[PDB]
């Protein structure tokens, strides 16, 4: 199937209390394999998956040096953003970065991603063409113009089309079955009486990987979006995921409703009923 590599950076300024906290996590698909945190005792890239532990000490030393430079870069990005938005120097602010590559089963690039948020809001994103920018507001336009003039997109394109793909391919080889697996959802429906005149149907999906899933209810084939309670997809702790969808139904009309599950691990989506 298809695969992604992503790095997620979080920087958080703390004025008068030293350098901003910088945290990176790295993912293949929904598997975290690395982390770096500037607050940790000896800040070092650390493994967080078994299949990346085989990398030698030079790999950890190298990535450590990279994150250390990244932390200083983000600190200066935060300084710059404060000016653009003309803000106090007294309060805390957040800069988030997300970048990586998607590859098809053939292992070639499908799509590169490179994008930023300031204080939880879109700031700037590299377009799918990897040659041009979408700025979220007039401040981001300042960043856009300096990046266009300096042709910094070309350097970002080289990482995403080149290295990003090579590292992902090597991590997929390292991981074998633990990354090429799709675990289908374990699915069932439970009935919970509310009154004489109403009952809750809860449709469950357990132990699925990857996290992407669609869980929906239908009344005789019709959408129940506004009448469906739907919990956020949640981790089990063992690198599988969980979800449920509930809908309050008039008692006796249970046969009218159907739960629909779509997941990579299901070639055909499931239709669960209550008879």
């Amino acid at each position: 199937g298809s695969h992604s590599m992503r790095y997620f950076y979080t920087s958080v300024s703390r004025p008068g209390r030293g350098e901003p906290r910088f945290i990176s996590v790295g993912y293949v698909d929904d598997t975290q394999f690395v982390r770096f945190d500037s607050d940790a005792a000896s800040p070092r890239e650390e493994p967080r998956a078994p299949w990346i532990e085989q990398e030698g000490p030079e790999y950890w030393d190298r990535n450590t040096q990279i994150y250390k430079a990244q932390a200083q870069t983000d600190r200066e990005s935060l300084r710059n953003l404060r000016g653009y938005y003309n803000q106090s120097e007294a309060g805390s602010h957040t800069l988030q970065s997300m970048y990586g590559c998607d590859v098809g089963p053939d292992g070639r690039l499908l799509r590169g991603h490179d994008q930023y948020a300031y204080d939880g809001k879109d700031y700037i994103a590299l377009n799918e063409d990897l040659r041009s920018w979408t700025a979220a507001d007039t401040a981001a336009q300042i960043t856009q113009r300096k990046w266009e003039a300096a042709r910094e997109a070309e350097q970002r394109r080289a990482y995403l089309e080149g290295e990003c793909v090579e590292w992902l391919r090597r991590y997929l080889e390292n991981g074998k079955d633990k990354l090429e697996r799709a675990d289908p959802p374990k699915t069932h429906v439970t009935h919970h009486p509310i009154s004489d005149h109403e009952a809750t149907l809860r449709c469950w999906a357990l132990g699925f990987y990857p996290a992407e899933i669609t869980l929906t209810w239908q009344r005789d084939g019709e959408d129940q979006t506004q009448d469906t309670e739907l919990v956020e997809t949640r981790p089990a702790g063992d690198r599988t995921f969980q979800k449920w969808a509930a809908v309050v139904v008039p008692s006796g009309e249970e046969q009218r409703y159907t739960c629909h599950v779509q997941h990579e691990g299901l070639p055909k989506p499931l239709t669960l009923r209550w008879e």
């Binding site: 990176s24 990535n63 870069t73 200066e76 990005s77 930023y116 910094e152 970002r156 990003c164």
Partner: peptide, 9 residues
Amino acid sequence: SPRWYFFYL
């Protein structure tokens, strides 16, 4: 591995 090109916003 993480990218070793850096960019100031």
